[PDB]
Amino acid sequence: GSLTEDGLSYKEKFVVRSYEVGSNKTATVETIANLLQEVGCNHAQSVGFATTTTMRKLHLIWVTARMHIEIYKYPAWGDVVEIETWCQSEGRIGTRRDWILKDSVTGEVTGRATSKWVMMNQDTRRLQKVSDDVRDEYLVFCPQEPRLAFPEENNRSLKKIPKLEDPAQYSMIGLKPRRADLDMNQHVNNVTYIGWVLESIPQEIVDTHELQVITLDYRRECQQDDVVDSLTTTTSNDSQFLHLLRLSGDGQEINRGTTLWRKK
């Protein structure tokens, strides 16, 4: 865990653990997503923090609107992965955080991710634009010239996601979080939703295909004592799926997303 020489970014190395890998003895997307949110956390600390002076006064926090992860090589059990991360202002809309995943050995890129964070009141739960007093407090910790994990003119990162229409092709019912799914402030961990989305995927897809891309929009949080239904429908070599999570009660939307898989 260290800031680069210009200290506008942060690199960290992780060894992939026995309990972090799947049936292929390569890291699960959930382990990856956990490494991302861990390196993101160590970057905040390293620059003095990401609740600011003005944000703590006004009881506001960063929440995640969208995550987007693209993987080429899932690192093997006992392989070292290097993750460089950094953050940039979207002027008034909120902040973006980007990641690159590299093989420690070859130095070749095996993954990249981008997230969209927006400002929210802790107590009332109501979103709002970024006050310039807040912008100016973290602008001095970001590259000023743009630096995009997903630069391409037509990238799948900013692509608009439909609501799944009943009936769903596939579903996983009655999903609840346990204490291991809670973060340190007792909210459901953003990685759990990834896992809940993937529960509706048929085992045969997972067994024969590799997850290449996942886009996940975040609408409402799941509470400790809520219950989630996970709905999936094919939309397609490569397989694409449309995903919806909702409360099994009123059918209130909490998440929507798409995933893209290739044959092994």
Next chain:
Amino acid sequence: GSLTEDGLSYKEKFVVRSYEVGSNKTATVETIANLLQEVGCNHAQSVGFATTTTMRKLHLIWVTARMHIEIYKYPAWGDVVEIETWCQSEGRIGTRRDWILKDSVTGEVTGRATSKWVMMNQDTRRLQKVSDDVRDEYLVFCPQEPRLAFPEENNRSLKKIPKLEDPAQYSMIGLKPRRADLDMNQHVNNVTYIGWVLESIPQEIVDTHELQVITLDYRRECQQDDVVDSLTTTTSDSQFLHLLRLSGDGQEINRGTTLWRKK
């Protein structure tokens, strides 16, 4: 990390991660339990592996019968924790693996664990005594004179556990495993049962106390498409008796006990 000088134990340092800690910003017992599994594997790697040359020719695997963990201080988010592990045969009654947890900075003991492993046929799931062929192959990687994280005669770690009787005081029902709960061979991993056991403890207890001790017997494996009920009754510091059982037929998978101190 590395084998100690004598190559009869293994040590590893772990930095506690943001997503590995609970509401008081110290490691959960499940993170601890996962660190024990991880260092356990890195020890087997290091001495050349378990599944010995026979265990494979015979289709035999090591299976957890007992897990015993006692925590004095849960390491804080950002702290380094050194864990030393080592093995030792319990005659034809399987093998024992023990752990010591130290604070890196002070070298002070913050927790200790012991686990009972027994050989079964993976295809038939048939429990059997450890043969002499398997014995000679894996005694060279163990201390010969005994070395116990829990040496004290008639201690917590060997105390026979009763079956909870209905009605239970507390119950979390309908618990199912997701793919994150599967190890690399598609079996529910030994750490998930811990979480399932602890889910029946009242939140107010978790909020006012710290788990000092947990003992867990492993009767039968829960399968990907099984459903578990988690039952708890106060027996008392606070003490509880635990039963995990299949939602339908009511078949037992685990029993256990937990001891909690006030903060």
